[PDB]
Curated annotation (Swiss-Prot), chains A, B:
One of its GO terms (biological process) is NAD biosynthetic process. This is Nicotinamide phosphoribosyltransferase. Homodimer. CDD domains: PBEF_like. It catalyses: beta-nicotinamide D-ribonucleotide + diphosphate = 5-phospho-alpha-D-ribose 1-diphosphate + nicotinamide + H(+). The modification Phosphoserine is found at S455. Its main location: nucleus. One of its GO terms (molecular function) is nicotinamide phosphoribosyltransferase activity. The lineage of its organism: Eukaryota, Metazoa, Chordata, Craniata, Vertebrata. Changing D202 to N/S: No effect on activity towards nicotinamide. Alters specificity, so that the enzyme acquires activity towards nicotinic acid. The modification Phosphotyrosine is found at Y171. It is an enzyme of class 2 (transferase). Inhibited by FK866. FK866 competes for the same binding site as nicotinamide, but due to its very low dissociation rate, it is essentially an irreversible inhibitor. The gene is NAMPT. Keywords: Acetylation, Biological rhythms, Cytokine, Cytoplasm, Glycosyltransferase, Nucleus, Phosphoprotein, Pyridine nucleotide biosynthesis, Secreted, Transferase.
Length: 470, 470
């Protein structure tokens, strides 16, 4: 059993004794604080609301367990038993909290309010920041979705330049990250975030998360194809790599198949094994079932270029209408080693310079896609901006002398469209003046109930690229 | 409800069709591959074995669900229903797998076998690498434990040099990482890995994980103390920072209390508020209840040094027997911003150069400790080294021409003590020659049962620093 009373930073257990006396309201907000990643995809809050925050989340037993744990953990009795019992007795253990959020999938520039949190009962002023820790973990799906989207921009730019269109863009960056993340839960969350932008994944955990918490009209939100790993090649023995390749492409003769080719010598594999010995098994394949050759080692750019050079001399290459070289439709390449947002850019630019179409290549990314990301990439942060004490509201904030970048916003916040159609966050309750049209934040959680939800289809629509919007 | 049939990389669903015909055995191993991190702490496999791998992990319902999901995911019927049904019918859904591993908490040089996996039924040759994905996630607790231990070495060195002993070392690096990790599950796993080396944590999730899967003689494996956050200071209003400080130290007058002091001006807070206005409330405190001043912004080293210099002029400083400056026992500092293994080193060395004892300071680390780590840091990797096909065992491996660092080991593996008492991994079944004594790996999992396990107390003992043992 998950216990929300045990799902906070230890020090937050002690904060109910630290706020000003006679405080009836604590109001806090989340932003991806300003100073590359100029705009962020808001995604993942709905998962947290449903899995952890909604319904009866307080019980007699959970309160007693927290009491027992904290007694030993602090070697002291500090723990707001009275405060938690109040929620249990008054609200049947539902959290007296209201959360307002920008719609999921929305693409918002840095430094804007993305969601706000406040208590709905004066007794529970302490609860707003109790749940900071769990809500701030939304940094992860936001960051995966954003970084995945930025890679989609790079791919779109180069695919368009080298081919004249964006056909198949949504399968150009595949999630290989299941083994390389920190947990099963992280795998599902991160994979789901990547699927906001693409349709290809091997991180199966993402599928069930989307089905349970978001939903799609299609049976599944992500797809894959058969592929070898080094074990299915090397098991045949060093002298039998050709036998492995032949067996595998024949087993998967009528679907696309990726075959890792660098077990011993990627260049030999391309030029002699695929390019000569087994060439007859390749050139006979359907356009709907290409062989996808997979290098997996060496300098990513150098290796991709050398593989393409080798294949271009063993297979019939055409020149497309943009002037770029194109392998025959039954043959493609996938680079799935060392791919991150930086190396992706390097590879596609290198290909373009050597006159190879991005049509020729797909990418897989594991650690770079799902694990090599932190909360400080987008400066995802939760801060109190407004309190009511003795019936008077005051606008509060931090502003550390040595770091203006950590200054936080003041007062009650709202998010608005500007006259030019951009975004602006209004501070100090100025949204109440109604000079800027409707607040784009919507109540998504109130008093233990999820009040507004988005489908995965809606999220995908909101997160589209401008070029996709033609 | 976790389903092991949906907890693998998609392509592994297709591998049972790719191995050589009549393969009865696939044998694989995990290492932290050689190229500072020269030695790794082996920790976390026991969690995976118990939570995910043991007992009846296959049911009719789980098979049908996987079948239904993969049909859509692959747009084809590639799923091995028969193979999974065999496990259900023959072994009541228990995995016919044997896993041997080095004891948890063991500190082992890079490039050694840490665990091995093989099928115990010839029909389940495909099962060995099915579970690669889930087992490889052990990289995370291994890496957190290892990186946390490397930071303990730094702290030990400087604490010993500046004070003459290691008293309180186990509380010098505190886990602040709960909000900065990618999920609740990751938080618990990561926190538990840090607790292999230290006793201080705010990531409460780590406590219940340890209790459930490992166990300690003590009631809890980790501890904390009351502390403020920016919201409990700023809520008082910008003109009332002093009132906030006074309220908090008075509420927590007889236990240690950390109070964040950089909301507006860290240097003013130290020199004028703590150092003058509230000095009388500080010098009266017990040595068991110090005020711990917490800066949280600016250059970490520069800020710590300036804070110490300020405090040194407002409070009575002594010189310890090693010649280093020491704040009075009722006053300490905690630096919890921007701390990672690199900045930790820079701060303690800078303090040493300015003649400040490491006794004066403790560290908190969040993102650096639990999130800013990837599988490539220690090159944690799972590879097939031995197969049996047509009754003949063959030693198998990869050895990519362009990257000798990715070469894998050959044949049946074992771990041994050398004549000088170091570790060596024997390949090609050479352990059977008995020239190197007994295999140090133990069977930890066999046919659905955990066969050997370790308490958290034993893991801690195994992971001790030499300087602690000495
Ligand atoms: C056919 C079409 C053009 C629509 O799509 C593609 O051509 N793609 C290129 C090939 C593709 C699908 C997209 C990526 C997957 C093949 N999988 C693969 O190579 N894997 C899986 C995996 C998981 C973890 N680690 C290592 C690997 C190696
Ligand atoms: C008294 C003794 C000498 C034994 O130990 C210390 O002096 N310590 C320094 C103070 C200590 C305990 C060890 C760390 C905790 C105070 N907690 C704290 O500042 N937090 C918690 C937190 C969690 C997430 N993010 C930000 C923070 C800010």
């Amino acid at each position: 059993e998950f216990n929300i009373l045990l799902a906070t930073d230890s020090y937050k257990v002690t904060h109910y004794k630290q706020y000003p006396p006679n405080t009836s309201k604590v109001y806090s907000y989340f932003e991806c604080r300003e100073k590359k990643y100029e705009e962020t995809v808001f995604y993942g809050l709905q998962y947290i609301l449903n899995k952890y925050l909604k319904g009866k989340v307080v019980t007699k037993e959970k309160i007693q367990e927290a009491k027992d744990v904290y007694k030993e953990h602090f070697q002291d009795d500090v723990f707001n038993e009275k405060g938690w019992n109040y929620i249990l007795e008054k609200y049947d253990g539902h959290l007296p909290i209201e959360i307002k959020a920008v719609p999921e999938g929305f693409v918002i520039p840095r430094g804007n309010v993305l969601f706000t949190v406040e208590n709905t009962d004066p007794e529970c002023y302490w609860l707003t920041n109790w749940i900071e820790t769990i809500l701030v973990q939304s940094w992860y799906p936001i960051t995966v979705a954003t970084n995945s989207r930025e890679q989609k921009k790079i791919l779109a730019k180069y695919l368009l330049e080298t081919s004249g269109n964006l056909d198949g863009l949504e399968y150009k960056l595949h999630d290989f990250g299941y083994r390389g993340v920190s947990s099963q839960e992280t795998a599902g969350i991160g994979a789901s975030a990547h699927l906001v932008n693409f349709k290809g994944t091997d991180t199966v955990a993402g599928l069930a998360l989307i089905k349970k918490y978001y939903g799609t009209k299609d049976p599944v939100p992500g797809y894959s194809v058969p592929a070898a790993e080094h074990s299915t090649i090397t098991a045949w023995g060093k002298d039998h790599e050709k036998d492995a390749f032949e067996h595998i492409v024949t087993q998967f003769s009528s679907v696309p198949v990726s075959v890792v080719s660098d077990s011993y010598d990627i260049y030999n594999a391309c030029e002699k094994i695929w390019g000569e010995d087994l060439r007859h098994l390749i050139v006979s394949r359907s356009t709907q079932a290409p062989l996808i050759i997979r290098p997996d080692s060496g300098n990513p750019l150098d290796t991709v270029l050398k593989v393409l050079e080798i294949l271009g001399k063993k297979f019939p290459v055409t020149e497309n209408s943009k002037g770029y070289k194109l392998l025959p439709p039954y043959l493609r390449v996938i680079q799935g080693d060392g791919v991150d947002i930086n190396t992706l850019q390097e590879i596609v630019e290198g290909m373009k310079q050597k006159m190879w179409s991005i049509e020729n290549i797909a990418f897989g990314s594991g650690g770079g896609l799902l694990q090599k990301l932190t909360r400080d990439l987008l400066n995802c942060s939760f801060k109190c901006s407004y309190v009511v004490t003795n019936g008077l509201g005051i606008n509060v904030f931090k502003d550390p002398v040595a770091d203006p970048n950590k200054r936080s916003k003041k007062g009650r916040l709202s998010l608005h469209r500007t006259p030019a159609g951009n975004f602006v966050t209004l501070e100090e309750g100025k949204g109440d003046l109604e000079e800027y049209g409707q607040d784009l934040l919507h109540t998504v959680f109130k008093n233990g109930k999820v009040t507004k939800s988005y489908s995965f289809d809606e999220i995908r629509k909101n997160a589209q690229l401008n070029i996709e919007l033609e």
